[PDB]
Design a protein around this nucleic acid. Structure first.
Length: 58
RNA sequence: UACCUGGUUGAUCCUGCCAGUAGCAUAUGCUUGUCUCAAAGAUUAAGCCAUGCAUGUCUAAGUACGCACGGCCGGUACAGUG
């Protein structure tokens, strides 16, 4: 990147969906030791659609 | 059912072939009411091919973060069907 902002590209940011799934890749992104529960730090997709209940998928 | 019969001469006896006769298989003609099985683009061109179909596959048990549905309970790693 230079110094300006191109309006079609740079100013937005994407939610990079689908976090890590293998239990070693969780600890590489969150820096857990052995005694930390990996399932404490799992990413949950904030799922939402009209006409339906708010659901959360992991 | 281990079979013969007409044809050479004025007449005869033979050699001998032609012709008939009976199946069986391919075609074909004329005809064809019922009923049971049944072959069927081999022969000529292993010639040429429109179109469509003829090879796919998930259990409890390889991989599910598709809400595509719905379901507890909403900090519940993953309910489930898929």
């Amino acid at each position: 990147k230079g110094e300006k902002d191109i309006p079609g590209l740079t100013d937005t940011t994407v939610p990079r969906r689908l976090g890590p799934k293998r239990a070693s890749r969780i600890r590489k992104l969150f820096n857990l030791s052995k005694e930390d529960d990996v399932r404490q730090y799992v990413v949950r997709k904030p799922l939402n659609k009209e006409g339906k209940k708010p659901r959360t998928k992991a």
